[PDB]
Amino acid sequence: GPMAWASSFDAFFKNFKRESKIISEYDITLIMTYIEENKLQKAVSVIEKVLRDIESAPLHIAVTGETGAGKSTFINTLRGVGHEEKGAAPTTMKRTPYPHPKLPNVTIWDLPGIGTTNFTPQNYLTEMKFGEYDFFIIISATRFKENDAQLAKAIAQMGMNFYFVRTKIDSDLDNEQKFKPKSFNKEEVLKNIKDYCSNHLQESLDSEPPVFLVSNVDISKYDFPKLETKLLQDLPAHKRHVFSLSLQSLTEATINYKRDSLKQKVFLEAMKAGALATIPLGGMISDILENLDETFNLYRSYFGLDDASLENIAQDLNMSVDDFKVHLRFPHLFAEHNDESLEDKLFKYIKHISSVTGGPVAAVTYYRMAYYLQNLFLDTAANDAIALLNSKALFEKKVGPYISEPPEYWEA
Numbered sequence: 001g002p003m004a005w006a007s008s009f010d011a012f013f014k015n016f017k018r019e020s021k022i023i024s025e026y027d028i029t030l031i032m033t034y035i036e037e038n039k040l041q042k043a044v045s046v047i048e049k050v051l052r053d054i055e056s057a058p059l060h061i062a063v064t065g066e067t068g069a070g071k072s073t074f075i076n077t078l079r080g081v082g083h084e085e086k087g088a089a090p091t092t093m094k095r096t097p098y099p100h101p102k103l104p105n106v107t108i109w110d111l112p113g114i115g116t117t118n119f120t121p122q123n124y125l126t127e128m129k130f131g132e133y134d135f136f137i138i139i140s141a142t143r144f145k146e147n148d149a150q151l152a153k154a155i156a157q158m159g160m161n162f163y164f165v166r167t168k169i170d171s172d173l174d175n176e177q178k179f180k181p182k183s184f185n186k187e188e189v190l191k192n193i194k195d196y197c198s199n200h201l202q203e204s205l206d207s208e209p210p211v212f213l214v215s216n217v218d219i220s221k222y223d224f225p226k227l228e229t230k231l232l233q234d235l236p237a238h239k240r241h242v243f244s245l246s247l248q249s250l251t252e253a254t255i256n257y258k259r260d261s262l263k264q265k266v267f268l269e270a271m272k273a274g275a276l277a278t279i280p281l282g283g284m285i286s287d288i289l290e291n292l293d294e295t296f297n298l299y300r301s302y303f304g305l306d307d308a309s310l311e312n313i314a315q316d317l318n319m320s321v322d323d324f325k326v327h328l329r330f331p332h333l334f335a336e337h338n339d340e341s342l343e344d345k346l347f348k349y350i351k352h353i354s355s356v357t358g359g360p361v362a363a364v365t366y367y368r369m370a371y372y373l374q375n376l377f378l379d380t381a382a383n384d385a386i387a388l389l390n391s392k393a394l395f396e397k398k399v400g401p402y403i404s405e406p407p408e409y410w411e412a
């Protein structure tokens with residue numbers, strides 16, 4: 001009943017990383033208050049408004065910095081757009097929008113360097129429509145300018161978030177290794193660049209800013225993963241979903257941010273639809289799977305598992321997409337294996353999933369069968385995306401017929 005539903009809602013959200021939660025701790029408190037106080041309609045109204053916010057949330061990112069800093073390349077890398085493609089930022093004194101190719105409501109803006117302009121910091125922000133943005137990225141390939149520190153100070157005074165991004169770190173490291181092959185120390189180079197930049201910036205700021213050292217040519221390396229985590233941490237909870245969807249699927253961490261965001265969203269949808277007192281029946285599973293077809297194709301698109309995206313990795317292993325797909329779990333996820341019935345496997349899965357946030361004592365909270373099928377597909381899709389990152393190596397060491405880990409609780 002109500003008290004079991006509130007405690008299982010709290011237990012569900014406790015399982016996620018702090019920077020991944022798509023609702024605030026106050027949203028959680030308010031939903032639990034209404035459920036515990038027998039105000040179930042008020043609880044469902046909060047959840048509906050949260051889902052509307054999450055689903056309609058725009059994301060506008062301002063990227064500012066001088067010419068030669070790798071700003072175009074950064075804007076393209078963030079969007080997953082190749083340098084030669086249509087929509088690519090080309091590789092000069094108004095702001096330019098670059099829409100995300102795959103997500104309507106996400107725009108990366110190219111702002112000209114304040115140093116290109118004769119404006120004060122305050123007036124530069126008015127001119128560039130500062131109110132439109134979720135945060136600012138201040139990019140340099142060198143050291144920063146007093147110019148950048150003053151702009152950051154102005155942004156902080158408007159109560160908004162900025163991040164100093166130092167590009168081309170891979171080029172500086174390569175040059176030093178070639179210069180000093182016997183005494184090269186990567187960590188010393190990184191510390192010396194970060195320290196120079198933060199020490200000069202702080203001369204005009206409240207406290208020591210973090211500087212993120214990145215390579216625009218590999219978003220997996222250096223401080224780029226730390227930057228993605230900080231950007232999530234600092235966003236409003238409701239904007240973390242669209243930002244997670246905007247990330248590449250090029251690291252296990254980014255795949256897991258997408259997996260976690262989507263699992264939270266489909267749980268909220270399940271709450272909105274309503275808790276059930278008994279395990280849902282499997283009589284109509286093919287009809288429920290057919291109703292989810294568009295959804296499962298969307299999930300494939302998010303994880304890079306659509307047929308078009310599989311072509312690149314398959315030629316890479318020098319095999320056909322079809323041969324690669326034999327070794328992935330998502331195609332045959334809802335197929336009978338070892339003559340175990342799909343309904344019996346789902347009944348077992350539901351008992352585990354509902355035991356994880358319910359435990360052995362209190363009334364069990366069940367949801368509609370569609371919730372469990374979505375949850376299962378998302379875990380499978382993510383585990384298939386992780387395996388694609390290391391396919392060559394996984395393929396050699398045949399750890400069974402699939403290269404991916406099984407989705408939690410499905411196999412027995």
Ligand SMILES: Nc1nc2c(ncn2[C@@H]2O[C@H](COP(=O)(O)OP(=O)(O)OP(=O)(O)O)[C@@H](O)[C@H]2O)c(=O)[nH]1
Nearest residue numbers: 067068069070071072073091167168171215216217
């Ligand atoms: N190795 C490496 N090359 C980079 C990086 N960022 C940009 N580049 C390359 O820099 C070259 C062009 O230099 P820039 O003009 O500074 O690059 P951009 O992205 O066009 O720069 P902006 O003038 O700031 O828009 C291109 O070949 C980019 O691929 C980086 O982090 N590492």
